[PDB]
Subunit: 167 residues, 2 copies
């Protein structure tokens, strides 16, 4: 016949897919409704709060800058002044110790470049030596191994397509 | 002999590499020196500028908040007040037009899901059909082609290592 087989290959799963999804998705409507209701009831008071916020924030803004802005600004001038006076001499001293730290570190870099090279050169020499014969078999096995994983994925897309196509 | 050949395979290029590099890199010292000098001569005036900045910025800070802070705070109250009064009704109206825009758009999604599916299903059906025979030859050529590029890189690392190793 051309019914049981046609339907089987047709793929009825798709129907339940969009049907089941859309069915539960319908709830989205209810959710939005509730949100709106809360937004309205909350809006009422949310308005008084916003305005009441700028009111207290406004008077507190200038009322805070006076005492704070004055103490902070004042303390800052005196704080920086002293720090600067001491930072003046310390600046040169620190620069000397720091300038030497960086320069000194670079010093070893000169002799380290040659020594390191000999180390990295010999290190790779031995490794590469063993990697030669190991790579031959390594890549060899990858051929079939990598194909196994690919074949599986290829069968999935080919199978899903064949069935989905029906014919 | 064991000189001309030993040196040739040894790789004298490395010597000129670090030598030439370090040679020009030496300039770094001079650069740092100049920077320091400029930092000192600039520091002198940079000090008066920093302090003179907080002085004018301090008096201008509060002197600006008075006129500005007042206009902004005042204008903001009258600006928001009016905007809110009109936004009250417009809010609901807009929500209606917007709520319908999103919902309406989703409407077509229901019938589009089925129609689109039939389109994407048939589209891949034909493509995959031709991709089958095309993939066979596609991957076949990739074997040798991909190997050509790999071989080149493999010869570089193998060549550089062999010569660098000398022995």
């Amino acid at each position: 016949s051309t019914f049981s087989k046609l339907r089987e290959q047709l793929g009825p799963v798709t129907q339940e897919f969009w049907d089941n999804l859309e069915k539960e998705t319908e709830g989205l409507r209810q959710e939005m409704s509730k949100d709106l209701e809360e937004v309205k009831a909350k809006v009422q008071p949310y308005l008084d709060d916003f305005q009441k916020k700028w009111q207290e924030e406004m008077e507190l803004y200038r009322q805070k800058v006076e005492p704070l802005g004055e103490e902070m600004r004042d303390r800052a001038r005196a704080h920086v002044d002293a720090l600067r006076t001491h930072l003046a001499p310390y600046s040169d001293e620190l620069r000397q110790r720091l300038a030497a730290r960086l320069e000194a570190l670079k010093e070893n870099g000169g002799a380290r470049l040659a020594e390191y090279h000999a180390k990295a050169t010999e290190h790779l020499s031995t490794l590469s030596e063993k990697a030669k014969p190991a790579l031959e078999d390594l890549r060899q096995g990858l051929l079939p191994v990598l194909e196994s994983f690919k074949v599986s994925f290829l069968s999935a897309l080919e199978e899903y397509t064949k069935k989905l196509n029906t014919q």
